[PDB]
Design an enzyme around this catalytic site. Sequence first.
Site, mmCIF file in Angstrom:
data_model
loop_
_atom_site.group_PDB
_atom_site.id
_atom_site.type_symbol
_atom_site.label_atom_id
_atom_site.label_comp_id
_atom_site.label_asym_id
_atom_site.label_seq_id
_atom_site.Cartn_x
_atom_site.Cartn_y
_atom_site.Cartn_z
ATOM 1 N N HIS A 175 49.006 41.631 45.316
ATOM 2 C CA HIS A 175 49.437 42.330 44.210
ATOM 3 C C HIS A 175 49.203 41.524 42.916
ATOM 4 C CE1 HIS A 175 51.599 44.578 47.107
ATOM 5 N NE2 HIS A 175 52.329 43.527 47.333
ATOM 6 N N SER A 179 43.977 42.605 44.727
ATOM 7 C CA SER A 179 45.275 43.121 44.732
ATOM 8 C C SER A 179 45.379 43.734 46.138
ATOM 9 C CB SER A 179 45.668 44.168 43.789
ATOM 10 O OG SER A 179 47.028 44.629 44.157
ATOM 11 N N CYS A 196 64.124 42.854 46.209
ATOM 12 C CA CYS A 196 64.492 44.497 46.325
ATOM 13 C C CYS A 196 65.785 44.849 45.821
ATOM 14 C CB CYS A 196 64.043 44.799 47.866
ATOM 15 S SG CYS A 196 62.416 44.672 48.641
ATOM 16 N N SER A 203 49.759 48.432 42.640
ATOM 17 C CA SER A 203 50.674 47.167 42.328
ATOM 18 C C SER A 203 50.303 46.578 41.258
ATOM 19 C CB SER A 203 50.906 46.386 43.482
ATOM 20 O OG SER A 203 49.646 45.788 43.899
ATOM 21 N N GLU A 207 51.786 36.143 53.513
ATOM 22 C CA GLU A 207 52.890 36.259 52.496
ATOM 23 C C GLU A 207 53.953 37.250 53.101
ATOM 24 O OE1 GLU A 207 53.494 35.051 49.623
ATOM 25 O OE2 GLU A 207 55.116 36.602 48.514
ATOM 26 N N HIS A 241 59.074 42.455 41.939
ATOM 27 C CA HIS A 241 60.177 41.420 41.969
ATOM 28 C C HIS A 241 59.862 40.689 40.780
ATOM 29 C CE1 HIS A 241 60.722 42.463 46.128
ATOM 30 N NE2 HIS A 241 60.446 41.347 46.596
ATOM 31 N N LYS A 281 61.556 32.017 50.928
ATOM 32 C CA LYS A 281 60.711 33.148 50.843
ATOM 33 C C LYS A 281 61.351 34.021 51.518
ATOM 34 C CE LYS A 281 57.641 36.458 50.982
ATOM 35 N NZ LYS A 281 57.816 37.787 51.744
ATOM 36 N N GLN A 319 53.720 29.382 49.040
ATOM 37 C CA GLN A 319 52.332 29.563 49.342
ATOM 38 C C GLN A 319 51.158 28.257 48.847
ATOM 39 O OE1 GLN A 319 50.394 31.624 50.391
ATOM 40 N NE2 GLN A 319 51.359 33.583 50.320
ATOM 41 N N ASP A 360 62.889 36.303 48.328
ATOM 42 C CA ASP A 360 61.927 37.463 47.946
ATOM 43 C C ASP A 360 62.515 38.831 48.679
ATOM 44 O OD1 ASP A 360 59.821 39.220 48.672
ATOM 45 O OD2 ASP A 360 58.392 37.743 47.877
ATOM 46 N N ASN A 361 62.430 38.849 50.110
ATOM 47 C CA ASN A 361 62.627 40.153 50.675
ATOM 48 C C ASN A 361 63.882 40.854 50.563
ATOM 49 O OD1 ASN A 361 60.632 38.503 51.891
ATOM 50 N ND2 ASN A 361 60.548 39.720 53.703
ATOM 51 N N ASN A 369 56.151 33.511 54.990
ATOM 52 C CA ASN A 369 57.258 34.626 54.940
ATOM 53 C C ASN A 369 58.517 33.943 55.359
ATOM 54 O OD1 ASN A 369 58.310 37.439 54.671
ATOM 55 N ND2 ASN A 369 58.915 37.238 56.680
ATOM 56 N N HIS A 425 55.704 47.714 53.619
ATOM 57 C CA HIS A 425 54.320 47.580 52.922
ATOM 58 C C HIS A 425 53.306 48.669 53.004
ATOM 59 C CE1 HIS A 425 51.428 44.393 51.908
ATOM 60 N NE2 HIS A 425 50.400 44.959 52.883
ATOM 61 N N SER A 483 58.595 32.238 46.674
ATOM 62 C CA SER A 483 57.681 32.550 47.534
ATOM 63 C C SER A 483 56.441 31.937 47.045
ATOM 64 C CB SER A 483 57.320 34.026 47.439
ATOM 65 O OG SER A 483 58.624 35.006 47.460
ATOM 66 N N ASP A 526 48.282 38.918 51.597
ATOM 67 C CA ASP A 526 49.644 39.844 51.642
ATOM 68 C C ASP A 526 49.552 41.053 52.462
ATOM 69 O OD1 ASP A 526 51.891 41.067 51.085
ATOM 70 O OD2 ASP A 526 52.239 40.010 49.280
HETATM 71 N N1 LIG Z 1 57.904 45.985 48.586
HETATM 72 C C1 LIG Z 1 58.183 44.624 48.784
HETATM 73 O O1 LIG Z 1 58.361 44.108 47.540
HETATM 74 C C2 LIG Z 1 58.386 43.892 50.040
HETATM 75 C C3 LIG Z 1 58.875 42.632 50.163
HETATM 76 C C4 LIG Z 1 58.915 42.059 51.219
HETATM 77 C C5 LIG Z 1 58.620 42.866 52.485
HETATM 78 N N2 LIG Z 1 58.051 44.179 52.383
HETATM 79 C C6 LIG Z 1 57.720 45.005 53.532
HETATM 80 O O2 LIG Z 1 58.829 45.605 53.946
HETATM 81 C C7 LIG Z 1 59.056 45.805 55.455
HETATM 82 C C8 LIG Z 1 60.137 45.411 55.971
HETATM 83 O O3 LIG Z 1 60.385 43.832 55.893
HETATM 84 P P1 LIG Z 1 61.563 43.117 56.246
HETATM 85 O O4 LIG Z 1 61.177 41.520 56.004
HETATM 86 O O5 LIG Z 1 62.808 43.603 55.922
HETATM 87 O O6 LIG Z 1 61.674 43.148 57.959
HETATM 88 P P2 LIG Z 1 62.788 42.990 58.970
HETATM 89 O O7 LIG Z 1 61.991 42.848 60.331
HETATM 90 O O8 LIG Z 1 63.771 42.145 58.456
HETATM 91 O O9 LIG Z 1 63.442 44.654 58.887
HETATM 92 C C9 LIG Z 1 62.839 45.565 59.242
HETATM 93 C C10 LIG Z 1 64.009 46.616 60.049
HETATM 94 O O10 LIG Z 1 63.677 47.728 60.255
HETATM 95 C C11 LIG Z 1 64.473 48.150 61.225
HETATM 96 N N3 LIG Z 1 63.835 49.487 62.005
HETATM 97 C C12 LIG Z 1 62.562 49.392 62.718
HETATM 98 N N4 LIG Z 1 62.299 50.589 63.026
HETATM 99 C C13 LIG Z 1 63.352 51.383 62.490
HETATM 100 C C14 LIG Z 1 63.544 52.789 62.665
HETATM 101 N N5 LIG Z 1 62.839 53.682 63.306
HETATM 102 N N6 LIG Z 1 64.687 53.241 61.893
HETATM 103 C C15 LIG Z 1 65.429 52.328 61.328
HETATM 104 N N7 LIG Z 1 65.400 51.131 61.367
HETATM 105 C C16 LIG Z 1 64.313 50.542 61.963
HETATM 106 C C17 LIG Z 1 64.310 47.036 62.168
HETATM 107 O O11 LIG Z 1 65.381 46.882 63.166
HETATM 108 C C18 LIG Z 1 64.491 45.862 61.380
HETATM 109 O O12 LIG Z 1 65.740 45.325 61.407
HETATM 110 C C19 LIG Z 1 57.718 45.156 55.741
HETATM 111 O O13 LIG Z 1 56.530 46.140 55.927
HETATM 112 C C20 LIG Z 1 57.380 44.156 54.803
HETATM 113 O O14 LIG Z 1 55.922 43.431 54.891
HETATM 114 C C21 LIG Z 1 58.088 44.696 51.326
HETATM 115 K K LIG Z 2 57.861 41.653 37.869
#
Ligand SMILES: NC(=O)c1ccc[n+]([C@@H]2O[C@H](COP(=O)([O-])OP(=O)(O)OC[C@H]3O[C@@H](n4cnc5c(N)ncnc54)[C@H](O)[C@@H]3O)[C@@H](O)[C@H]2O)c1
Ligand SMILES: [K+]
Lengths: 462, 464, 460, 461
Positions: free
Chosen positions: C52, C75, C194, C80, C155, C373, C185, C385, C189-190, C180, C314, C381, C130
Amino acid sequence: AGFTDYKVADITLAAWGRRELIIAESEMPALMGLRRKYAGQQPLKGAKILGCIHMTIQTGVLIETLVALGAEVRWSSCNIFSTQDQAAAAIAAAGIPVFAWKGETEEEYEWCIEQTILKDGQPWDANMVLDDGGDLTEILHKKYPQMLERIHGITEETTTGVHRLLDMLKNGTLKVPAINVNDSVTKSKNDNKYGCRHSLNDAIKRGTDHLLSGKQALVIGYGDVGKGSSQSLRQEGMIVKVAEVDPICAMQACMDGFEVVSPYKNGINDGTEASIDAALLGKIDLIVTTTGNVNVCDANMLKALKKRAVVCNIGHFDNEIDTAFMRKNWAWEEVKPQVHKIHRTGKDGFDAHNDDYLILLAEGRLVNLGNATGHPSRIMDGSFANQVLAQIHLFEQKYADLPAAEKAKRLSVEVLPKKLDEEVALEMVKGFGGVVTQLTPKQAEYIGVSVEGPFKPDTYRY
Amino acid sequence: TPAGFTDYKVADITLAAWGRRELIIAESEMPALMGLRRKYAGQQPLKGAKILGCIHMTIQTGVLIETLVALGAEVRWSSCNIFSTQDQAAAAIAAAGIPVFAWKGETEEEYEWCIEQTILKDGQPWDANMVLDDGGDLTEILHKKYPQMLERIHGITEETTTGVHRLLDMLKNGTLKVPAINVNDSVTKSKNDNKYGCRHSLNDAIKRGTDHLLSGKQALVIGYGDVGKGSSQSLRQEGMIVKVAEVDPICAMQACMDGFEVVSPYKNGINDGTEASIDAALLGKIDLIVTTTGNVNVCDANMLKALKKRAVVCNIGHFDNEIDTAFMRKNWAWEEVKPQVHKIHRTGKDGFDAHNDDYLILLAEGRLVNLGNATGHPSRIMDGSFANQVLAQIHLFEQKYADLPAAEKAKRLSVEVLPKKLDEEVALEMVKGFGGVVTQLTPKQAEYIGVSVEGPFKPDTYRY
Amino acid sequence: FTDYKVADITLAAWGRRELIIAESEMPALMGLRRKYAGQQPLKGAKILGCIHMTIQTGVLIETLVALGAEVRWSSCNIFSTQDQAAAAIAAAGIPVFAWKGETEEEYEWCIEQTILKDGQPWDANMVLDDGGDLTEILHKKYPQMLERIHGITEETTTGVHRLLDMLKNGTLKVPAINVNDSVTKSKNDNKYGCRHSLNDAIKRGTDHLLSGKQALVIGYGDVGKGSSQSLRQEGMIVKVAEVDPICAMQACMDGFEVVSPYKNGINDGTEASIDAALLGKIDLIVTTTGNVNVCDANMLKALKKRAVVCNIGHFDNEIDTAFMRKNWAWEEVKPQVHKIHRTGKDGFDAHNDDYLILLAEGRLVNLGNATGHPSRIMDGSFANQVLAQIHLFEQKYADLPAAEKAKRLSVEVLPKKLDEEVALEMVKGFGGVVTQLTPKQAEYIGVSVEGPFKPDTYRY
Amino acid sequence: GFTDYKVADITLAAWGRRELIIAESEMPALMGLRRKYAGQQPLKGAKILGCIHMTIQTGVLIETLVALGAEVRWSSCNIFSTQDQAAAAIAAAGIPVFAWKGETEEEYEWCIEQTILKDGQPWDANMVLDDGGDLTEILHKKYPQMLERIHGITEETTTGVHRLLDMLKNGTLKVPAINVNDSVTKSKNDNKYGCRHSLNDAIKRGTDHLLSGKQALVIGYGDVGKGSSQSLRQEGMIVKVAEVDPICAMQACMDGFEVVSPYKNGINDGTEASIDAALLGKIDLIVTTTGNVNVCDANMLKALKKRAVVCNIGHFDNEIDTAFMRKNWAWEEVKPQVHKIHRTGKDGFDAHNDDYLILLAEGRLVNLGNATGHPSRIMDGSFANQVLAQIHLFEQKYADLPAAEKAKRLSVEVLPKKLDEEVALEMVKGFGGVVTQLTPKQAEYIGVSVEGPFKPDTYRY
Ligand SMILES: NC(=O)c1ccc[n+]([C@@H]2O[C@H](COP(=O)([O-])OP(=O)(O)OC[C@H]3O[C@@H](n4cnc5c(N)ncnc54)[C@H](O)[C@@H]3O)[C@@H](O)[C@H]2O)c1
Ligand SMILES: [K+]
Ligand SMILES: NC(=O)c1ccc[n+]([C@@H]2O[C@H](COP(=O)([O-])OP(=O)(O)OC[C@H]3O[C@@H](n4cnc5c(N)ncnc54)[C@H](O)[C@@H]3O)[C@@H](O)[C@H]2O)c1
Ligand SMILES: NC(=O)c1ccc[n+]([C@@H]2O[C@H](COP(=O)([O-])OP(=O)(O)OC[C@H]3O[C@@H](n4cnc5c(N)ncnc54)[C@H](O)[C@@H]3O)[C@@H](O)[C@H]2O)c1
Ligand SMILES: NC(=O)c1ccc[n+]([C@@H]2O[C@H](COP(=O)([O-])OP(=O)(O)OC[C@H]3O[C@@H](n4cnc5c(N)ncnc54)[C@H](O)[C@@H]3O)[C@@H](O)[C@H]2O)c1
Ligand SMILES: Nc1ncnc2[nH]cnc12
Ligand SMILES: Nc1ncnc2[nH]cnc12
Ligand SMILES: [K+]
Ligand SMILES: [K+]
Ligand SMILES: [K+]
């Protein structure tokens, strides 16, 4: 078609504005319910309303409700930064006179109010006033007293505007009666508090994109705006300290879980730098003024603030912060619209990598409207339903047509009856899907109310 | 201490030293009340006052009592609820030579007898000239049974929302015989005590009574006034999923904006008297119901029949008729778990299976649960309420209503609140007790908003 | 300099003002600049980067450059990029190909412009990724380029999953570091990112009041935890769905009602399995899973009129947006905000009340409708990296003998001491003061005064 | 004629039984194990020495082990944590228990010894269940011949696991152990959310102090410090957090707390001058959560605000330097487990002295000392893990293995993730929560089985 009686930033934004108005209507059930309820009756037929309030999408829905109930209007914003240009364009394209854009100068601001007052160079045949902050009210009293002779009332939106009305009433200079819209509970304890809860951290994020969690905030004031502001920051994880002059409001801040502090040692503001709690202010990452008062974030406070702190104001007027001092002494670097770095190294020029600056939002003007979009539609629903009911009430009373002896009996600043406050509230609750219980006759008798309400004595504070 | 003192009745006088230790701690938590003691002790503004007091005999009430005495008053005291007394508080007050008739776990007959022991001294009416009441029960007995004593009484200072409502009904019906101060509606009472007190003490009482986890469970709070606001927060901050019922749309609006779902026990909010109007799906999911209304029968028999098995039922309004406990006494078998905790077995009236799964848990037999199953509000919150009480007593005692000619009596027969300046002064002492620092307006600032630098800072219409 | 493509190079001065502010918000990353500038540990590094193109990524890019690297950048999402950030990076003479609002075809072209320089494969030797798209393109389309690359630093949760599948399948060609799962991180971050940015994006896209309304968050991992908090702190009534019962237990204890869109949790494909009463009360659905079709067609048909639908995982297949493209009419409100009219496919009534509001076309909503973020969170994070790039570049895997490579081909994490050192700089950024153990106290709990303070099994 | 017990008052047994019957309805994972395994009797032949807080919740654990076939001999692992009605109910059921609230240290040791010995000779024990490691330590130091016949130890808490790992490192651990603490349904349920519920509970019962608006300092931000900080913040306290672990401190900052040190620049050099007296002089409440030694030391105690409350929710009472307070200051008992400590000196006190601290539970675990510890629905998770750990080690039969095979099995291990998840599922069902089932396509997409486990062993939740 042939309509030129307006001035906006860009009329081509109208289709966008209309799309957002259609969405906002679905978020404003109390206002839209008034449209449905009163459309046939046309209670505002013959009303000619001068309106001065933030020209947002929400004000758009208010304007078209007044028009749908029969009124004609001429509109301006009550702040130079609060207009949403797509909202202004959609209103202009509907054939409604509006003079408003985001980023007016002070001279343009006054010109815009004057364009509502005058039509084709002469006083419009106005007979009603809707105001937010009292600027249009003041200009009418100082410059157009002959127009007030034919005006039936003022409906005033905000705390600062009501204070100005009460000063006029005390001095015997108020010429027409007013409704204090602010002090409906569905305004004061919805808009002023929860609206700022929503839109303060909104504006700070849009302007700076700063993480707020874990950082130190100082909120000056703990009235309705200060309460909502403090919640806006605390719910984000800020460590919030609260300042107050009112010990009852300070008590609430303590019981609500905030530390109560003063910018001044032992709370004594004697004008000296020695009086500043420099250790306290040197730890503050964000200061927000919420008071409606003057110079509550003063020059010596600004000199003592932590490097790179954010400074903003969510009270109605920009004199809560001593921005004049900053314009006189410090160099301003625009980051982007409504975001300035203020370099405390001097007035003439700055180093692009200087670390000793403050970030000022909206040049000290209302930050929620200046750096974001103000309160959300579903909150403004409450405030603006009250506005419509207040306009209906004063227009039907026809104060300007009464004999002098009868005018004397009705020249006052009043609130809407509690029953109407409750009716607005119920429409808001239904919009959330909430289900209110109906008292049985015995239960209503037990607590001394009618089943349909009102449910509380006028002294009740909620 | 007085030699041969027997003019009291408490559970266990040996708890007095423990009570005294807790009074000494509580004094350090009540700066507004102790500031009144220090400020006014030498002036003795209550010298000659003879106060009948009826309010929960807690440690906090002990500090109030000894403040009135330190300012010159004599008092005779009872509790305003059968379960709210702290027996060590009652013992410490009795041991100090102060007549007190109060213990935890009174019967209804004993409750009335205790109030009468304050009214009577040595078999005859005491020469009382002041009344301090919490809920109106003492006020009612005086008007109903001893109306002649009211000829010498200068005023009533009433503590709580329900009692003020009773005074206002009497006033409008012409049956109130002495003027009164509504202590409840000082902001440092209503918006401190009623709200924040219940925030502190509701979850406290539920934990002491049941030791149930609250996080993750479903609660229904009936009412969203000051007590309902504080009760909802007490539960939400523990992680309960809280739903709120209300009849007042303005209060309901606040609950929505505060993050609660607003629901009715009745379909479409209409109680038509039938089981069919109960929202059985909703009630079958509720783990905890709390009544906060000051109204009658807001958790009714049909709701109790519909509640989820093993739900907790309690009331934090002033009187026990918020819940239809009479229906439960009539129809279901009560198993005492421990004092003020009962399992109510919905399998029938005559006996119960010790392992029956279909019961509800009722706390304090439906009486005020924070006082019944815990210790009610904490001292630092009661400081605000009781400072207002002392100021109201001083004001009415100095007015001397009972000595006025009947003409002036008609002009003064009123229910008043204390002035906002006094409300602010109480608040300032509370803020200082937290270490808070209140800013002083400059003269230019005070002129700008149209107030005195010393206050008051808000018009009387302000709602805070 | 013309080796770039951005939306508008004249936004560069604005981007540079925001980079100067962001640097003051990123103490761990700027501390790495100061401490490694002398060594120049990335001298000779030629890094392909795909993440991004935000202001925060600009500070990361310029840190890598300050430590000696050359980079070529794109990106990892079509929505993004912050155009002023891309401009400022391009104006600094750094090849970047990125703008807000790319098409899928332009997105792929941008990655290819980093891979190729003057029509030939760049002599890249490091990969920063990423989501795994650049990693995938290199393995499938330019496998010979991988013979010169010393490592990949990935990432995000989804990208790590893809790396592990490749390692299990014997198809990963260079070693990688799982960035990650540093605690600074993942657990910063995660989750916290959010929390800051989900409600931010919803407000910017709709300006809807959230307080008092009903939300359904699908997922309660790190992103779902932070998302649920972002909404609950605004006063939403939040319900949580999960397939993982441990995560579901946490949601209960955290004060949320745990529900399924399906009756008894059983997703059997039929409309009859939908809990229509539940979905008909939901004002906002947010997907957080990294899984496929967790807000499916039958759920979308059952949702309350005018509900908002968005995705913060993602990839944009968490919501069945293809079903909505096929069957319903889209009305753009403004960029990245669409009303989806459930009345039919060909046309719509401008005043129809039966619509859903979709944000960012189902793509990462925090980056699509706001700015992702904040700098002080991305600091954690991106310090990881940089450290991971230094480590793999100094290891020089591409120069090892084949027998030494086989023992080096792994997906590893950074040591806990470095994780702790990143955290320490973040804590100082808040003005926090960490206490130092006495020798006796360190002995008592069985750690060094220097740390690490926890075993590798500790979950924080 | 059952006499093989010692409790405060056996006549409390009926009251204890009423509370056990309620608690069973709050513990669905544990009662699920009862119904699932009662027919199989997987603990038939197990003879368990148990040392853990003799609460109502422990009563349900004990009766689950017995229902599955075990015999037990029980003591508490803390002198103040027993609920006397729980102890009475267990003794009245014919189960040997030696426990009461308010033991002396000599009585505490004697109670453990009464479980170890039966009729004056070593009991034929073959399993150990421990919370904190005191029973484990006494067995290794004093009864090595008993350990030859013991199949394993299931250890409840962070401090006890540390003690086990030290023995393993030193080669002094004689039998294998299961670390029950580090199940997610224990550590991130019990340690965190249990303290969230029970810390403010104990402070209210002990002092009835208002907490809103007052200043707290929480020492530590691990699982217990996280839950303790939330317990106070949710009441409206202004909470500051101290930590030695920068990652835990980062979490505190991001969670909205100010991170401070009692020592200037965090340097604990043992001098009064090192104390941040301005900070300590503002603190109304200090809570220690570390499992470390002397984290609320004498110089901190001297600097604290007058009338501040001092308490500890870590396992042992040496987190606070109460020895210093015994030696130097006068103690006034307010009521059981609540003392005012008068800093005016040792030889008596003024009853109206204003310079005192309030110490809860004499510095012992405050949630169990001044209230009832964690609630049943939270202990359900920890104790389902305990039962499952007891079954696992008992079935392994380590004591009967050859020497070479013992060496291969001598370890401290956790339960597998599938068990952790199945415990969690029963807890979620107890809230009425509905877990969603993956489709085959979704399970393939994220690479898990539809029945789980759903996360790799590295996942931190
Ligand atoms: N937008 C952002 O800034 C950002 C930041 C970090 C990660 N992400 C993305 O967000 C996603 C989740 O990341 P994470 O670190 O929380 O992963 P994670 O493994 O910690 O959590 C995902 C959760 O989803 C649950 N899940 C799976 N299938 C499901 C379903 N059908 N119904 C309900 N729950 C279900 C799993 O049990 C798990 O607890 C990934 O794609 C990651 O790359 C986005
Ligand atoms: K920002
Ligand atoms: N931005 C918005 O959307 C918005 C909304 C509503 C009102 N307002 C404006 O915000 C202002 C405040 O309105 P309100 O309804 O909260 O009024 P209020 O009277 O309820 O509160 C103002 C508070 O400021 C305090 N105060 C005054 N001087 C102070 C000082 N020197 N230091 C500290 N505290 C001080 C007062 O004691 C009072 O409690 C007004 O100007 C009002 O018109 C703005
Ligand atoms: N236990 C305590 O320590 C304590 C403290 C203060 C007051 N109280 C008592 O609590 C009660 C409430 O006091 P308050 O100050 O909150 O009064 P309040 O008037 O502020 O609020 C009571 C609320 O109940 C609502 N209500 C009435 N009937 C209802 C019904 N059928 N269903 C739902 N809602 C209904 C009303 O609309 C009102 O908002 C009184 O009896 C008061 O004396 C108890
Ligand atoms: N009372 C209860 O119900 C209960 C429940 C579970 C665990 N415990 C006990 O609580 C203690 C902590 O358990 P845990 O699971 O939280 O352990 P933990 O390892 O997760 O956390 C302890 C924390 O203390 C910090 N710390 C150590 N020394 C410090 C110092 N000098 N200053 C500041 N912080 C310091 C460590 O960095 C660590 O983060 C243990 O003794 C455990 O057995 C008690
Ligand atoms: N502790 C307390 N003492 C007296 N009256 C009360 N009302 C509520 N709590 C109380
Ligand atoms: N209630 C309880 N029973 C047993 N051990 C505990 N540890 C913490 N709370 C407990
Ligand atoms: K808006
Ligand atoms: K109390
Ligand atoms: K318990």
